[PDB]
Design a protein around this ligand. Structure first.
Ligand code: M1P
Ligand code: M1P
Ligand code: M1P
Ligand code: M1P
Ligand code: M1P
Ligand code: ZN
Ligand code: ZN
Ligand code: ZN
Ligand code: ZN
Ligand code: ZN
Ligand code: ZN
Ligand code: ZN
Ligand code: ZN
Ligand code: ZN
Ligand code: ZN
Ligand code: ZN
Ligand code: ZN
Ligand code: ZN
Ligand code: ZN
Ligand code: ZN
Ligand code: ZN
Ligand code: ZN
Lengths: 302, 302, 302, 302
């Protein structure tokens, strides 16, 4: 059984009170390693999260934005004054959440949750893409249904694009010829009763290719709404088949800024990259800050 | 083994965005061949099908109606801008679905699913009848239980009306003296685990009378919710006894508009008629379009 | 993966119309092999089972009794005029169900479900004992809570009696010093989502001692209320730990008297016994008849 | 490591079957030492505890009351005919549970769990107060949320009242100016996976002031729902900081009347006082009786 090791006992990205769009939270960040640089696309909130009302109410409205940060060493980031993606469309009125970025061939796809705020189910997986991590376009609703925790596989399987998603409460897979229409939906992984991952599970970042299969980091929620990270291995040629799944989590809330925050007891990753024979796992903590934790690639054994 | 053969590589009926009632889907259609015309009674939806919520949600409400279309060659159909049947009671709040029409004693009986939208089990087999295929009367809930995939046999057995239905996950038969009270319910056919028909099965159109028995076209659902068509044969004098059943399907999603659509990976028939020594099988495709495949009845061998 | 083989394609015990206490059903039987004889203690009902009313209705009352039958060969049984256990009104007003018999030392313990009919939760685990399988005494409510699927282990563990029971929906274990007060309650096994055993599980007959552990046959229920038998292996010294569990069922409704009957789609065992290196598993079929199925002990591999 | 020592091998308080309100259980008692007398405010139940129903069922309704008992030696208590507090019908329909009493500036604050019985989360922290331990008044709901295991600190911190509570599964602190509105909610202590305190923790009695900090006895719950007592030390000037915490429990079910009872395997304290340089820790045993255990003040070492 292996676990992640935090690189720092302090957050590496925190909210910035002077910036409305990221005044209260930065968290759940996609990550791409390119040109010897860590590219973080982090969710940002202008407000705490009141979630216990019948419907989303203007008086408690929060807006998610996606900011960008970049780092050479993985620890110190250059940040920017404005977000790089905002919800401009009515179905994205309360913003854009939890991006996952996958490079397929020479294009980058960011899958995120657009939240329209018209009711608590007013969310959907959206996609934008770029060829430069800078000019995002091609917006589309990936599945026209309440769904989230979505990521593209970094390559095609038998000539088809592969989508991981999350019809409650399982991790699902789907296939597409054209990145518009999805078919061959299949459950690939389910929660487990009387465990830390009993309530629901969802993919973390997009799966990382290995020789022995696809490394699928995921998040699991217990009955107290504690979010932890677990890890599984998908079959290399049929990523719809799980060939190994670790029983214990690889990361759990332990530090004060993972236990305490806007949403207690959360570690949540939307991205991880392989660098120098190590896996770098960036994670939102308490839906308030971003941490980073690593595992030596050699220790990943099931 | 035998299989149906599509007549067209493109739909024969498709939605009409200009008509609210059939804006998004036309599928799962009853057919009766009278007066050397194909009379098609098709399900039509005003909206897409969000099915993954905990309950049916008003924000994602779809309403099914039954539309009428007529053809001389079974391929080209004339259509009309208003439907022939819509929901008239609260049990049909979300419309009327998947009609199966049977003629018994010069009365036409249409059995369909009334969906109230109050929860995902809020559906009922309902029945209307008419002298003329035009003026439907006598709406009634057939069984007061969550049930569907219903069809009447075109003849009485020992003076009794014969009903096929689908208490999950099997095809049931039941008997009635009066079309009101059903009794001697029993299971006549079951799914086969670890096959394309592992999850559930349901009758397709009403069985077609043959000299060697009743042709029972049915749909089977696999573990990933793929809907395909299969074929069984019922004893001629006792339609509760399955005397043959083909191992392999006779129709499965192959064309892109059967694989892709509002509900991927679906072929589904509510209707089939014998015409010029051929069986014409009309099917919904991806719950979005209607197609039609055939087999020469000489080729139906078990 | 291994499977039970039916000794007969016909029931070995069936209702006897001229005996009111068993005129409609005989099923779910305890069994004990002693004196080189199969002693069968079967549940019997005087009526069909209306189970879908808001409360148990007098006009649909069924009463369960325990009948006795004896066999030399495991297949051909001698039966008797009167039941050997009935309910003492009112806590068992609708009778005594699903006995599991365990021999501990030189006493025989029958654990059964007492059903009072006052509401659909009005059932509890009850126990009687005898030293001769004939004079049952010492009646008690084992757990004063709605619970069932109970059996005693045939030996003490570290001095303690060992109870299997079923707080919905898991197989539980517990311990006692006096066969009256139970403690150290623990879940030992759980249903598995998206499987034949997804809704709930419960112990079948009491576990059978092996060299490699305790054989725990159980029943699992899918989302369509189909009951199938499965099998697990408990640790020999600590039978609260499951050390193996076959994924596939070992017995499923297949024959027509197992698929159709008073309750469709049911095979259910309350008893199994080892005779000449063969496990004989008695099972109720559709809550209506009793079958028997066997497995060579050699073929029990996990 | 240090541990409590039971004063006696028998309960210091038991139910009285002839008194409906305390017929089945006396347990989880608040305690205050005043006038050289132990004042014990005990939870009492008219009924056993069926807890395994999907919802609270009126057929298994239990009603908790608060009784008063008084002692000079802390062992032999005088009791009274009638409870001192009952649940007001219907907001506290199933009674008033687990009181903790804190004295602040010559007033006594009793925080208890009001249980309305309408679902298993239909409970909240309620507070009454008095200046004489007799005339309780000022009832109010402390937090408008499902919450319990609540106690006030016996003095203000930087002019603020201090509230300990338990949003599942952690111990929380909060602050108030008015004993009405609480702010700056923070988790201060969490369970520990794979230990005796892995499922959840909650405060026991109100923290006891020491020279080296605030003694926080708490209960911990393992994955089989066994209840044990642990201890931590809070920073004297900032009770939100835990400066020490003992790995092993200080009390656990051991005696038969702690292991067996209405809820097996429970020791649970709502009160502890310091008398003559000794901590007297009163505890519910198996939710059925009250015991007392002690430790010399000087043996509290971390
Ligand atoms: O067996 P129980 O009492 O229903 O408890 C369990 O229920 C959840 C399902 O809703 C499980 O998935 C959780 O593990 C929970 O602990
Ligand atoms: O819906 P999910 O994936 O189970 O997680 C939701 O809550 C998480 C914890 O607050 C957040 O981290 C997520 O952003 C999301 O709002
Ligand atoms: O209820 P059934 O028979 O399992 O089929 C359901 O799904 C089919 C495919 O989506 C549809 O074609 C049906 O109309 C129905 O909604
Ligand atoms: O409550 P359980 O154990 O899931 O099973 C119930 O239904 C079984 C099948 O009808 C019956 O065989 C049992 O007798 C019982 O009534
Ligand atoms: O909710 P908590 O604090 O985990 O404790 C609950 O169970 C305890 C042990 O039975 C009881 O002692 C408590 O009264 C309560 O019902
Ligand atoms: Zn700035
Ligand atoms: Zn969008
Ligand atoms: Zn699922
Ligand atoms: Zn998720
Ligand atoms: Zn664990
Ligand atoms: Zn028109
Ligand atoms: Zn209707
Ligand atoms: Zn169907
Ligand atoms: Zn007789
Ligand atoms: Zn009894
Ligand atoms: Zn469970
Ligand atoms: Zn059971
Ligand atoms: Zn199977
Ligand atoms: Zn008295
Ligand atoms: Zn109150
Ligand atoms: Zn607690
Ligand atoms: Zn001990």
């Amino acid at each position: 059984m292996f676990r992640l090791t935090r690189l720092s006992n302090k957050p590496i990205l925190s909210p910035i009170k002077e910036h409305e769009w990221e005044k209260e939270a930065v968290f759940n960040a996609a990550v791409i390693y390119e040109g010897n640089k860590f590219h973080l696309f982090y969710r940002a909130s202008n407000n705490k999260f009141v979630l216990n009302t019948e419907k989303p109410e203007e008086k408690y409205k929060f807006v998610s934005s996606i900011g960008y940060a970049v780092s050479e060493d993985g620890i110190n980031f250059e940040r920017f004054d404005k977000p790089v993606l905002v919800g401009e469309i009515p179905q994205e009125a309360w913003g854009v959440e939890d991006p996952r970025i996958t490079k397929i061939d020479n294009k980058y796809y960011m899958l995120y949750t657009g939240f329209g705020g018209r009711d608590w189910l007013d969310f959907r997986i959206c996609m934008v893409w770029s060829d430069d991590l800078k000019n995002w376009k091609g917006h589309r609703i990936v599945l026209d249904e309440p769904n989230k925790d979505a990521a593209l596989l970094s390559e095609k399987i038998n000539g088809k694009y592969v989508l991981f998603h999350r019809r409650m409460p399982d991790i699902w897979i789907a296939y597409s010829d054209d990145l518009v229409n999805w078919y061959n939906h299949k459950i690939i992984m389910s929660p487990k009763s009387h465990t830390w991952e009993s309530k629901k599970i969802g993919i973390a970042g997009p799966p990382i290719k290995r020789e022995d299969g696809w490394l699928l980091i995921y998040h699991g929620v217990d009955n107290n709404n504690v979010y932890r990270l677990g890890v599984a291995l998908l079959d290399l040629k049929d990523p719809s088949k799980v060939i190994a799944r670790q029983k214990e989590p690889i990361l759990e809330p332990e530090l004060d800024w993972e236990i305490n925050g806007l949403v207690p007891n959360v570690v949540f990753s939307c991205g991880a990259v392989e660098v120098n024979d190590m896996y770098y796992v960036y994670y939102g903590a308490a839906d308030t800050h971003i941490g980073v934790a690593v595992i030596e690639k050699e220790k990943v054994k099931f």
